[PDB]
Amino acid sequence: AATSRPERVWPDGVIPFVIGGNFTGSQRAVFRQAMRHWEKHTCVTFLERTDEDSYIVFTYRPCGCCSYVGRRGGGPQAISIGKNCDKFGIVVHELGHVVGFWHEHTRPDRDRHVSIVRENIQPGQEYNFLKMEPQEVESLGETYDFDSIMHYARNTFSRGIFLDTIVPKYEVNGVKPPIGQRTRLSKGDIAQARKLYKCPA
Ligand SMILES: CCCCC[C@H](CC(=O)NO)C(=O)N1[C@@H]2CC[C@@H](C2)[C@H]1C(=O)N[C@H](C(=O)O)c1ccccc1
Ligand SMILES: [Zn+2]
Ligand SMILES: [Zn+2]
Known part of the structure; x- marks a missing residue:
């Protein structure tokens, strides 16, 4: 689910960045690797912020x-x-938002691909499962991606770990497709x- 708004x-x-204070050297390196991971496979580029007006700030915060x-x-x-x-x-997922991705389970066509088990959602968190309105999103011809780094796990915002909130509707290669990978x-x-x-191709 990519944003439709230019x-x-x-x-x-080109996405400039600042790494804020209060992070360990170790944590700082993971942010760098996450941005690099985006760069290895795409034409998206992360640059140290010099004097750009718009940029991201990795902020030490809940x-x-x-x-x-x-x-x-x-x-x-x-x-x-x-x-x-x-x-x-998780950082790669967050940078997914930054480059322009909503959660995959909120695609306007998501009901053809997953069931949402409403009774299993933590009360007050149901808004996290609302479909994006069709004007806000573009698929660009891409099929529903169960493997996306932007896809919720089976039990995200569930009342308990053994209760599913999202259940794929059909089999992919003989098997119910796994969801929620953060690798x-x-x-x-x-x-x-x-x-x-x-x-460029
Ligand atoms: C229980 C609290 C729920 C937190 C919301 C969610 C967190 C997330 O997914 N982190 O990875 C988020 O920040 N979201 C939802 C998933 C993508 C969109 C919707 C993002 C969001 O709220 N975006 C707003 C927007 O882009 O319009 C927004 C973000 C920051 C400030 C103002 C608006
Ligand atoms: Zn998210
Ligand atoms: Zn995808």
Whole structure:
């Protein structure tokens, strides 16, 4: 689920960054590797911020709200990295938001691909499962990507770990497709990022 709005797309795919204070050297290196991981497979580029007006700030802060999708413009935008959301794959997910990706399970067509088990959602967190409105999103021809780094796990915001909130609707290669990986960018994440930033083939 890529943003459909041209203004949230970072010009030339160049995203300047600041790493804020209070992080360990170790944590700082993981941020660098996460940005690099985006660069290895796409034409998106992360540059140390010199005098750019719009840029991202890795901010030492409790995990949660909110990661702006794409380029907000007219100033810095913060990425909240705390104790429990500082691992490489989580950072790659957050940088997914930064480059212009919503959560995959909120695609306007998601109901053809997953069931949402409402009764299992933590009360007050159901808004996290609302479909994006169709004007806000573009698929760019990409199929629903169960493997996306932007896809929720089976039990995200569940009342308990053994209760599913998201259940894929069909089998892929004889098997119910696994969801919620935070290891690397999927084939789909790369293909969709390349399309959104018009990366040379
Ligand atoms: C229980 C609290 C829920 C936190 C919201 C979510 C956190 C996330 O996904 N982190 O990786 C988020 O920040 N979101 C949702 C997923 C992508 C969008 C929606 C992002 C969000 O709220 N974006 C806003 C926007 O881009 O319009 C926004 C972010 C920051 C400031 C203002 C608006
Ligand atoms: Zn997210
Ligand atoms: Zn994808």
